[PDB]
């Protein structure tokens, strides 16, 4: 199916992607406050399928290493979330075989949402406290089927966000890694054989986020 290649070496933390996700799905805004960071919402939630995580790492001399991580569902090739939900109710979590999207339906309201969230090695699923439905990034599966890029991919001004067929995207990831590795010797791909959202990190992925990789 399809794959995202996310070149974090080009991210300006503009948060176009974060906003474009909400504009396309007409998602509500959260109540947020500043608690000493640009990062907000602080976490994914039932109404936030993507947030840009900001981490400052000290470096000797002027400036810092400012790490940006636009988090989303990895659309796992063999998704653990689905293994858990299926025990309660097939149809809560389904795989779109055209795109590779892992999709939550309204039937997630009838499964053990806590267990589904715990099964995810990237800690992605989020529960609505009211309806008990689960939400996360759906890959903009309906745009993709209709020949459009995901909202967060089309909006990205920097070339961070890339989307296409898995062969094309894995070839781009390999080529781009070699190139970026020049400037960022610790650069690596995130779990490139297990997921459909392949991040290029500029250093230890766990510096970007504790669940950046499995």
């Amino acid at each position: 199916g399809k794959m995202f290649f996310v070149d974090l070496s080009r991210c300006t933390a503009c948060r176009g992607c974060q906003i474009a996700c909400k504009q396309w799905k007409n998602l509500p805004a959260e109540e947020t406050r500043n608690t000493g960071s640009h990062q907000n919402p602080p976490d994914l939630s039932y109404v936030t399928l993507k947030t840009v995580r900001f981490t400052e790492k000290s470096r000797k001399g002027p400036g810092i290493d400012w790490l940006f991580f636009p988090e989303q569902c990895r659309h796992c090739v063999e998704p653990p979330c689905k293994g858990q939900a299926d025990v309660d109710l097939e149809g809560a979590v389904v795989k779109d075989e055209t795109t590779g999207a892992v999709l939550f339906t309204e039937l997630t309201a009838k499964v053990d949402g806590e267990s589904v969230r715990s099964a995810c090695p990237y800690d992605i699923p989020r529960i609505d406290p009211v309806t008990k439905r689960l939400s996360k990034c759906d890959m903009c599966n309906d745009r993709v089927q209709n020949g459009l890029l995901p909202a967060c991919v089309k909006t990205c001004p920097t070339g961070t966000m890339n989307f296409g067929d898995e062969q094309e995207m894995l070839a781009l990831a390999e080529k781009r890694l070699a190139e970026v590795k020049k400037t960022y010797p610790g650069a690596v791909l995130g779990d490139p054989n297990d997921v459909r959202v392949v991040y290029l990190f500029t250093r230890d992925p766990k510096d970007f986020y504790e669940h950046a990789v499995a």
């Binding site: 503009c14 948060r15 906003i19 474009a20 504009q23 000493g36 919402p41 400012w66 920097t158």
Partner: protein, 955 residues
Amino acid sequence: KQTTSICCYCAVGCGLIVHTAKDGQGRAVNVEGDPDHPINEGSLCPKGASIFQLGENDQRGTQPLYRAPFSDTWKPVTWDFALTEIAKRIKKTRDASFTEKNAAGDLVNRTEAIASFGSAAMDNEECWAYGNILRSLGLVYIEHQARIXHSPTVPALAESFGRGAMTNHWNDLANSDCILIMGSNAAENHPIAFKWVLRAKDKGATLIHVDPRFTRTSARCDVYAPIRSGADIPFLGGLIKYILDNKLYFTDYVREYTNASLIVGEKFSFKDGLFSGYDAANKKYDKSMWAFELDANGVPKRDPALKHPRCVINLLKKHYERYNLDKVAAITGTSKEQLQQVYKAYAATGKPDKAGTIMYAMGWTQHSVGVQNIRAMAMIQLLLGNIGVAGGGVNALRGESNVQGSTDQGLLAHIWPGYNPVPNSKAATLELYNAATPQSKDPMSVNWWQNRPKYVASYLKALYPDEEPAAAYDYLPRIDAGRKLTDYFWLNIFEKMDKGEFKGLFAWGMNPACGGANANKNRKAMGKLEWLVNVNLFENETSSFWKGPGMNPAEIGTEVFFLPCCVSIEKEGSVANSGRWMQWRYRGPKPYAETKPDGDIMLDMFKKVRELYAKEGGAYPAPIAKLNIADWEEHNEFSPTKVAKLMNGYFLKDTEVGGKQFKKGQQVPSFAFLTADGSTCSGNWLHAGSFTDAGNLMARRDKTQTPEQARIGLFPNWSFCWPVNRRILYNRASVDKTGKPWNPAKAVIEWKDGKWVGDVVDGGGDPGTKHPFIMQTHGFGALYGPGREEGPFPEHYEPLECPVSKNPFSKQLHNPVAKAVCDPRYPFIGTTYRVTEHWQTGLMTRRCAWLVEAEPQIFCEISKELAKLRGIGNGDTVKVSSLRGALEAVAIVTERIRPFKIEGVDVHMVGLPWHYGWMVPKNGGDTANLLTPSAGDPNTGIPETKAFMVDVRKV
């Protein structure tokens, strides 16, 4: 259905697609990027990406609102009532205040009792119409955004190259080999620009950010060089010395296309931080002392061997010899190591086959030597051969979507449209007005401003087509010759308002209750107005100043009219971006509720004034009654198309000009075919060529490029840029005297088979026959710039007052041609800046829940060193205070801010966003302009918002 638009935020000019329900008649249902637009290719930053939420917003105004004197509430009223009552206020105030002759007996025909602020947010056709309405009413106090961020610097580019504008354009950044971003946070403030910056990097460019702070820009550059506030001129002066010492200048370019070879007259000198001609009584220079040595024809003498001791280039070498790496490293706070690395990487672009560009926006150029900061950038670029070339230029990044256009349309007190000056009281006739143009005796100097009479006559014909230009000239108001020009500008408007000297203010598409420095003073000043007209999208801190913090509505007598305007995607018209691309956009959804496009609001207001004059008489009615608004109207509404056609201009009689025959009624094809004899009208000579007999060139969405155009991304058939579609200004400097490019792989123009191919040539003529800077009196890129008030060469004068007592370059500490208290209770250098997610005062973006979600509250950015001193931890609530006011913010403790060492003492910087205001959201915080001084600048008359003294204390 589906329509195209152009983002309503920053001057990148990204394209949008808008989907509207009910086959294009209902509400917007989606707004996203235009995948076919050549600048953004469908990408949008969070501001563009949330335009849907801006338009489809239940907090927008729905209809006009009236606040009675001493009332604590709004009353909803009809448009017909609101505009009739406003017309009556305008007529009463104009009739009472109109002065035919000034105290000296000179004709001025003005009212000084009404001021107007705004706006770069309006369409170009709306900006042009607005200025003409206000001037037809006799106004002279007409200002907007451009005074604050662009006016302090644009004379630097006019002095250096002959025009005030960004020299290249956004896509052109991708052709650069070295990008110096200095006085700009482009990744946050011009985000789509980083598409092209990072594409330059992909092709091997070095990206350098010179900034007091580490920002989202810095995160993506190769080199981050910290600089202490106000130390830019030292930094740039050091780069000039480095280039000269290391022989890295592009010799043939410097010799031929700059004024390097010109001989400066014997009266020029510099000693002890003072040029020759200094008047110490009035604190100004006699610039005639800076004249070149003229020959028997009145033309500057030249020594192309660059041997004469008074050659510009030899004077320049001598001037900059003080700017050694040790002194520069000591004042900038940039390590000698990092300075060398930046200088080496940037100076490497002096090679003919390399280009470097400099990007600046507002940064800290507001102060009295900001002009000289930019002058230094222009000079570095001329030494390296980077002016006129692909990937080169001085990319002076414009702020608002249409600030380029609002300035072009003369929404500033000193200019009519097209940069023709507002006449002063001694310009008694049109003939006297026209007498003022400097001439050249140099056959190779085009000196294009000699055509100004054609543009002034054609402008008068657009406004008053049935009147002879000499007669129409008497309809427009004049400023006093005897007064300082800054008396008519932004800061002095506030000062006058606080002294009770204005009866009325239009706050048209601005929020000065948050945008003006020293908000406490300005909010109280607004209570001295009799009447205030606010035209905006939402109720705001300006509309509602009378119920603001600490205000008692029962004590404020000001009448307020709030007129709700429609968002960008609800109207048609053009906006001119930073690269001068005049881009057409369409209506998607119908105007929300009873909101109206500005053009409809102003035209209806003016028509009601005209009706009052027709019924009652009053002061000097002719300018109002005879104004040609019929050319502006279709369907009983404002017509963007018809106003754009008039701004281009058309023939008012059969005309032979430029060796062609034109018929009465045809569009003027370019400003080359304007006349001074009443045969042509043109609302704005810069627009002549934008809307021809071929149609609306601004509305072209054509990516057709020749191979030469495509290689550098000119996109000449995508919209239209002034002047006459020259995408890269000064492009004759990009070739040798045979017309061959310095860099054929990235040619801008090239002489092939008897014609210039590529860009439209900036100045017609065979190769080697014309000097490349056609708007300069003498035709050269000016390394020595004797029109600047502070001197012909940039020189460090401390823009900081409080922490500096000594200047290491001379005995002159501060600008010798320019009352900070420096109270030790406020020991920190406060500064204000933007984040990616919010817009300006935040009037717009504080209404958009997705942007609030990301950046919900005012914050205060401080170093670990300042946090340690004050006992502040990350996320603590702090009180930031100054002599002018105080506010609360959330502390962000970050290594992205570091202390400055200034004269052996650590001096701490406190960063605040200026995007917050008391109206919305709940718990958002108030404007950082509570803190900022209004004292203002002697030279620029420009406020201080980038370095002002504060305290920060834990709450």
